[PDB]
Symmetry: D2
Subunit: 727 residues, 4 copies
């Protein structure tokens, strides 16, 4: 019509900008200069808008997109209105089935590069040269809830990476913990049904805190290992940038000489590991159910590209049987103290999608998509997965041509004798649709395996045994890995695990199920079991108190790589601070605060009791990002209250509650000058407290001290003190 | 690898060749330099073959495309064989639902151009300039049978043209007769269920010759006009090249002034009109159920492009009520004697598709696809069609993005706010998915209607009446048009109509249905009614004998434009002659025969009793295309038998049958020298018979006479004589 | 209304009648006294018609099933016509994909009974008791052509039997020759693409008589055994009644003791083996493309029930 | 049609009428009803035209639209009275 504002302010800057500074936008508009081979290959299907006429799908220009055709301006709508019917038809058919699991997920484009050639252990082309760059598309997800459920639920997270290599798509489809719940794929519908909403009423969404889950767990101790991980703060990551990734299964690397090496895949977050606390996570599902999705997108728009290091645990074929646990058992992890992770390469996620539906929702990842240089093993969970991903994609994406949906296409050549199916895009000119043929001189042709550009040939593993439906006896140990995990956690991590079990079991309506789980905990660790029992009003029996603890794992009592926090890795870049304003802020404080944060790549949001602007002591006009209620402390990592007319907000219950919530969730707080008046709301003593930064002004060491706390993520020593505060 | 022969017999010449001379091939390989804007724009999706490795759809090279992965070479197949499962999955899912009606069809690419600007009567961009070339894709079809049914059934034929214009796709979805069976779209499922295979047992395929069809006709006299056409030889076209097309409905042309002109659309076959005879068509359904599909493909490969002239019958809006039938009634034709067809442009079909499934099977034509400069009318059959074609495509082609299937895509721009849907190809970058919007300055934007490049606005027809489900009384006349058609036919055409009704009704099991049909015929014409009654063992009553004939149509008793044959327009270019060989043929006959045929662009096929070659009297080596039994006379337009050692064939039962059959089917036969020994088998007297060419040798005059017979198509004078030959 | 004839000759006799004597009818109207456990359990989804009002699928009685709702009797059809749109919508969506292979097929209900208990060699319940009667549904078919292709093509034929046993459905999915064309399932798409209509033009229907099939055969000698069968008169059976059936593969029988016995399955036509000749078969594809479907239906209606051992 | 997989959604148990439904519609994905009507079209004689149309009337009658008067040109236009 001519509907935009004259200043051009409807349009975000096509340049990196902090979160909240500009409206977010399709990736190709936001970052037009950020390219890779896959992103370039999608140009053929990207559709613009500006300066084009509005048409039907058939290209007929529409004159009046405001009205149906009727007989009289108050008359009945006419069936001949093809423009109305095409328009409503498309709308009526917008939806496709969501993924059966991991329906909720958020995705981005990036690139991967190896640090050195891995030719000695694998002929995989994408790992053959440090100068070889592989486009990726990554989706992170929750597990149980639908595509419209909340982000910060307690759940395992999915971490799936599509590598568009020169010799084929390799999908690495992993999670954020190094084991899974179950051993054999045949049980996946039972486990998933147990954790998903219960079938009579479809409650609860996004939660394992209900009877059927804990019933199944109580009857299937193989689940306890991943359940320990889920109940720990691992189940509630601060963001996808701050969690680990794992392939879980042992796979094989195959080199040019035909040697097989056992491998488990790791992703290490270069930003470090960090999680929420449960009360914060749960509240955040209400205040911002899109928190992780938003955080991912805005990090990328800001330039805080999520980076991950790919690492391999490598085990020689001759060492297959050298551990207390079976390598093929996906409920067991391989302790880094026994087998180190060797760094392999770096993955950087640097561009958001243009259209979430077209790129994210239709993306299809499947762990059967491997490339020469890789192979499978007989892990019975993996073995069944290979069937499932292909099968489910045929309904979810509407037939067997899902690889022609643009996000899914290989960047490399694909030719074969497959034809037809729904939505077929490729128009084949081969005279032949079969081989062997003479009529096209047998093209396209098979290719023998070889060191590079060769055909896929399976590693010739020996198979010997009878056709059985039987769990290997080597898989029948359930408690030592849970115990190993438990003992590796810090005291505050352990408390969080106790609290997770305690909260979940309290939602289980049938008391005998709670009892049964507590009994299982008593096989893992008596201290764990006692603390959970106490929280449930349950008394362990003398028999339970006497259950002997499970054996160590190959002589390991603990392994600190299993803790989120035991070995600090605190990166502050990309984190965010709430600044609580008043109507006459000390402009000197604000210059110091904002500049110090910017120097470390830490973002800020200026909050007030209303939107608009406030004016500082010296006339500086300050734009307000959000209100105290609008952007609660849940959404930030720390809080700073500069000096000024504090009486303006000391009376504001919202401002006080802001600090009390941030205090309760162990976040750093800094109070400059008269802001120290807020000490009383949070019961801070005159002399002070570790984790509260206070000075006459925001000058000197004030910002370094606050940033030091932010590097340590949360203020764990504050835990005994929070029990009392009413928040 | 080395499977093609080194001589190169495996690959057809990239140049026009006669039917049977080379193996047929994908259009882009056969005629790589036949181009138009649509065919060029499909290049992004054309996939080649030669010199590429065989891969999975994920781009992984396959080493052994001969074996499943098993444990041991005689062991069980393993679930981890992703290469097998992908290949079998795609195969398992190749099929999509066939079209509900017109499932059986054959298609080709071409182009249209107008003869002059039609801007005085329509602002349609494709009709504005004789230098505007519009790509087309045209699909011809039968109605009833499945996609696997036979071509030369007795049926109406579909003639659908997709015009890819600069202002939108216009689909002109017509048939080969100028009316339809029914008046209101609400009855379409009734009619189509009646004609389709009966629901208990699903018989018969591709035939209206069964009880339910004639039951419905007998009860719904509106059907009789199109039934007359179907029972005539119109129902069995020689080829899609030799039949007329009609839009059936009155539509509107709208000019820049906004004036509406009523129009009915016509296609005139520039090759002329020509049909098979019933016995030939029925036999052809068994010997070559692909006859018309083949004939189209091979005509195009030979450079014998199907050509049609677009014609308009134009009626001023003020003349709406000037006829004694209703213009909106699709069971009524507009006699050309009353409203002539203005010749408007020419369409040429000049390239076969590359892949039948991708381009023909997936093509989607819908009469609701119009463009500015065209509009609908209230014709109640057309009105309901508008709903159906959009609706059916949603399931047949798997969702609302069927316009992104390559063959269906407009060549002109399309931009709107529609999103998602199964198999969404387009990746939208517009910040906005709604209008009005400010965030993308309201683009894409509506366009006011105008003289050129304007938005679509419906013609503001006055609607006055009550909401009623009621047939207009103006539509309640059923016999006068059937009569006009009957009286317009030649005597042999009338006899073939009688024979069609008689043959169908003889297969109707319930005698009362046959009698009710003969009663309806008595309301049309008494001679027709008596002739059919007589063949059915039925005696017209006193009453039936005295039914008053229906009136003339605006004083017209007949209109020669409704006969296939009454007015000569015959043409031989692209027809075919079988030449019956012997072991020592008179080379001089062959040279003259072949020279004369080539001169007129008529093709020859050389037949004998075995494959291989024979040698002519003078050592000329003649290659044999097929055997007498392997390429029966059904498949050719005429038969010539040259001189030589006729004893080699004169006792060949098949050689005789060939001539008896061709004779039965009223085809021109030419006999040279010792070929005249065959005259005995078809009981021809020594003084000749019109339609049998015979001379001492195959001279220049002998060929001239034969080509004259071929231009008149069949020897109608022979009909009274075919009684007495057992073939 | 007055629509049926007064003498009642619109209605086929509900008793066995020879081919062509009466119009064919749905099995439960033609032979209402024939029953088996499976046919009896289908009764809850059978829908009648006599004396009922014509309705929408939501159960709304329709008054005028001859016309669309329009503004004026010569006016535009209105979008509010939900009776018209439901009717056209269901019509528009009648089709489902045909089978990838064996799309052309004809089927009938029947029953199976073993001569004696085979418990010594298999614990399969349907073979445990000469008194145990097992309902069946059997579909015979060609291989290559679409559902709308002709019956009497030269083709291998399918012979598929669904046994509704008390311990599960057993499907015996066989052909009318004892072997197949290929050795490993991986090549199935290759062989079937080769035999099916060629991908550029989709010709020919229902026939192996084209280049790509014989190309494949010439390059894959394993196909020669079944090709010999197909080129013989086995490829053109007189009717589904007079052909053999075979499971082809070796399967196992497992008895209560756990003993495996290797087994190949056979169907013997009790009407004897008989085939057409090629010229007769080809001509019949033209004159009656439904000849085998018709033959099967009409035999059953006449009481010449197909029997197999 | 897409959400419930085809035109037989009325045969999904929760959606089924409890009152009689009979017509000449056939087929469609997941067809549950097995029709025995020799006829799948009307008018038919072979089943004496059943199931039959029912005139409108006071009770148990066929649906007939209220015969509202329609007067106007074919327009894509918002009524001024809505503004
Ligand atoms: C090691 C244990 C497993 C891991 C790490 C894992 C990981 C994942 C991830 C990350 C996704 C979402 C991919 C995306 O973002 O689209 C996913 C989806 C899925 N998973 Fe798995 N999964 C596991 C076990 C299984 C098992 C045992 C089965 C069944 C046999 C299975 C069946 C599925 C299916 C059907 C989907 C939806 C796939 C789609 O619609 O594209 N998963 N899984
Ligand atoms: C003047 C009368 C009619 C003519 C000339 C006509 C013409 C045609 C033609 C030529 C085709 C095949 C298009 C192709 O080759 O893909 C076709 C298909 C079709 N027709 Fe019509 N038809 C008529 C009446 C109707 C009516 C009254 C309806 C429904 C109310 C209808 C519904 C359909 C449907 C559903 C298809 C299949 C469309 C597809 O699957 O893409 N037709 N028609
Ligand atoms: C011993 C060799 C084979 C025999 C005897 C056989 C037999 C049959 C029969 C009789 C049918 C039709 C069933 C019916 O009437 O509905 C059929 C269908 C089918 N067959 Fe096989 N076949 C064989 C090989 C194969 C192989 C190797 C494959 C794939 C790897 C295959 C895939 C199919 C498929 C996809 C259908 C359609 C199934 C459906 O849509 O319900 N066949 N086959």
């Amino acid at each position: 019509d001519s509907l935009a504002p004259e200043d051009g302010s409807h349009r975000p800057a096509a340049e990196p900008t902090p979160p909240g500074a500009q409206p977010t936008a399709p990736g190709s508009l936001k970052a037009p200069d950020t390219r890779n081979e896959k992103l370039n290959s999608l140009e053929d299907v990207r559709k613009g808008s500006e300066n084009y006429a509005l048409t039907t799908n058939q290209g007929v220009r529409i004159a009046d997109d405001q009205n149906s055709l009727r007989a009289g301006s108050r008359g009945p709508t006419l069936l001949e209105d093809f423009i109305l019917r095409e328009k409503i038809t498309h709308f009526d058919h917008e939806r496709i089935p969501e993924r059966i699991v991991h329906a909720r997920g958020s995705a981005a484009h990036g690139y991967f590069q190896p640090y050195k050639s891995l030719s000695d252990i694998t002929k995989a082309d994408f790992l053959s040269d440090p100068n070889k760059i592989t486009p990726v598309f990554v989706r992170f997800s929750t597990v149980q809830g639908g595509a419209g459920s909340a982000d910060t639920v307690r759940n395992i997270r999915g971490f799936a990476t599509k590598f568009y290599t020169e010799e084929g798509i390799f999908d690495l489809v992993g999670n954020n913990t190094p084991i899974f719940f179950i051993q054999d794929a045949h049980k996946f519908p039972d486990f998933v049904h147990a954790v998903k909403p219960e079938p009579h009423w479809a409650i609860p969404q996004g939660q394992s805190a209900h009877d059927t889950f804990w019933d199944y767990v109580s009857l299937q101790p193989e689940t306890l290992h991943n359940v320990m991980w889920a109940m720990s703060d691992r189940g509630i990551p601060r963001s996808y940038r701050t969690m680990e990734g794992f392939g879980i299964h042992t796979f094989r690397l195959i080199n040019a000489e035909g040697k097989a090496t056992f491998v488990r895949f790791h992703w290490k977050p270069l930003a470090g590991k960090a999680s929420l606390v449960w009360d914060e996570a749960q509240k955040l599902t209400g205040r911002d159910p899109d928190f992780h999705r938003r955080e991912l997108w805005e990090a990328i728009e800001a330039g805080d590209f999520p980076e991950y290091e790919l690492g391999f645990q490598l085990i020689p074929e001759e060492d297959e049987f050298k551990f207390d646990f079976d390598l093929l058992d996906p409920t067991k992890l391989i302790p880094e103290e026994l087998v180190p992770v060797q760094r392999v390469g770096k993955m950087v996620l640097n561009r958001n999608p243009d259209n979430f539906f077209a790129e994210n929702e239709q993306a299809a990842f499947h762990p059967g998509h491997i490339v020469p240089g890789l192979d499978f093993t007989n892990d019975p969970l993996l073995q069944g997965r290979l069937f499932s991903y292909t099968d489910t994609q045929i309904s979810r994406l509407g037939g067997p041509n899902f690889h022609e949906i643009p996000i899914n296409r290989p960047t490399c050549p694909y030719h074969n004798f497959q034809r037809d199916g729904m939505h077929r895009m490729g128009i084949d000119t081969n005279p032949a649709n079969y081989e062997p043929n003479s009529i096209n001189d047998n093209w396209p042709r098979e290719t023998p395996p070889g060191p590079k550009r060769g055909g896929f040939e399976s590693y010739q593993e020996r198979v010997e045994g009878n056709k059985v439906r039987e769990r290997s006896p080597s898989f029948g140990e359930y408690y030592s890995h849970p115990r190993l995990f438990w003992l590796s956690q810090t005291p505050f991590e352990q408390r969080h695990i106790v609290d997770g079990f305690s909260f979940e079991l309290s939602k289980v309506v049938r008391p005998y199920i709670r009892e049964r789980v507590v009994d299982q905990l008593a096989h893992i660790d008596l201290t764990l079991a006692q603390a959970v029992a106490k929280n449930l009003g349950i008394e362990l029996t003398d028999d339970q108190l006497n259950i002997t603890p499970p054996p160590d794992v190959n002589g390991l009592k603990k392994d600190p790589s299993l803790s989120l926090y035991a070995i600090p890795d605190g990166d502050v870049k990309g984190r965010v601070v709430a600044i609580l304003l008043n109507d006459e802020v000390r402009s000197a404080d604000l210059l110091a605060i904002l500049k110090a944060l910017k120097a470390k790549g830490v973002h800020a949001k200026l909050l007030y009791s209303r939107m608009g602007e406030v004016t500082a002591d010296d006339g500086t006009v300050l734009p307000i990002a959000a209100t105290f209620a609008g952007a609660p402390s849940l959404t930030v990592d720390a809080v700073i209250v500069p000096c000024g007319n504090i009486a303006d907000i000391a009376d504001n219950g919202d401002a006080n509650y802001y600090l009390m919530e941030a205090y309760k969730h162990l976040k750093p707080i800094a109070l400059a000058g008269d802001a120290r008046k807020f000490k009383a709301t949070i019961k801070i003593a005159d002399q002070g407290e570790e984790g509260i930064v206070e000075a006459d002004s925001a000058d000197g060491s004030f910002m370094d001290e606050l940033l030091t706390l932010m590097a340590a993520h949360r203020v764990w020593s504050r835990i005994p003190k929070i029990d009392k505060i009413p928040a």
